[PDB]
Amino acid sequence: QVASGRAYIHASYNNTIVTITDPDGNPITWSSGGVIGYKGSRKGTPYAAQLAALDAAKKAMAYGMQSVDVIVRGTGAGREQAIRALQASGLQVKSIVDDTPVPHNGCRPKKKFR
């Protein structure tokens, strides 16, 4: 059981993945557009992220989790709604930080990003 921990929001154009960890960063539970039952592009919808964030929060609280720090990565549509759903879940959201990876001009991207 862990009272406080972290909530990671991996939000892309195709899906939203939410994984709740412990304070060290080790996963307790996770959920996504797939887990709450969507397939295909539907997983990238804001509502999908909402159900996902909830199901992840619900599962987490079942381990005693009360407070979380929210770490957000990605520019997906389901982003804000996931953040929303975490707040409106019953968890304390002690903080909110975006840690989205951005290169300082590293590897050549695939064709579609050029």
Partner RNA sequence: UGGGAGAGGGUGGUGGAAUUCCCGGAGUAGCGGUGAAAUGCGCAGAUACCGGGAGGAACGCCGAUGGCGAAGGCAGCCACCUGGUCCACCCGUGACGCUGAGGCGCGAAAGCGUGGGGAGCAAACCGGAUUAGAUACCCGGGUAGUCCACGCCCUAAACGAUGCGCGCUAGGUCUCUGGGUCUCCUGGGGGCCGAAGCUAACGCGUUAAGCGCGCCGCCUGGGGAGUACGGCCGCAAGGC
Residues in contact with RNA by the rule CB under 7 A: 6, 8, 10, 12-15, 17-19, 21-22, 24-30, 32-35, 39-44, 71, 73, 99, 101-112
The H or E element that residue 98 is part of is strand 95-98
Contacting residue, 1, 39, 104, 108, with another protein by CB under 8 A: 104
Contacting residue, 9, 54, 96, 106, with another protein by CB under 8 A: 96
Task: Decide whether 41 or 95 has the Cβ nearer to another protein.
Answer: 95
Could you say whether residue 95 binds another protein (CB under 8 A)?
yes
Contacting residue, 92, 98, 108, 110, with another protein by CB under 8 A: 98
DSSP for 14-55, please give it: S-EEEEEE-TTS-EEEEEETTTTT--GGGGGSHHHHHHHHHH
Task: Decide whether 77 or 84 has the Cβ nearer to RNA.
Answer: 77
Task: Decide whether 77 or 96 has the Cβ nearer to another protein.
Answer: 96
Does residue 56 contact residue 69 with C-beta atoms inside 8 Å?
Answer: no
Cα–chain-centroid distance for residue 81?
10
Sign, CA torsion 80/97/89/44: positive
Count of all residues that appear for the chain in the document: 114
The residue ranges that bind another protein (CB under 8 A) are 95-99, 104
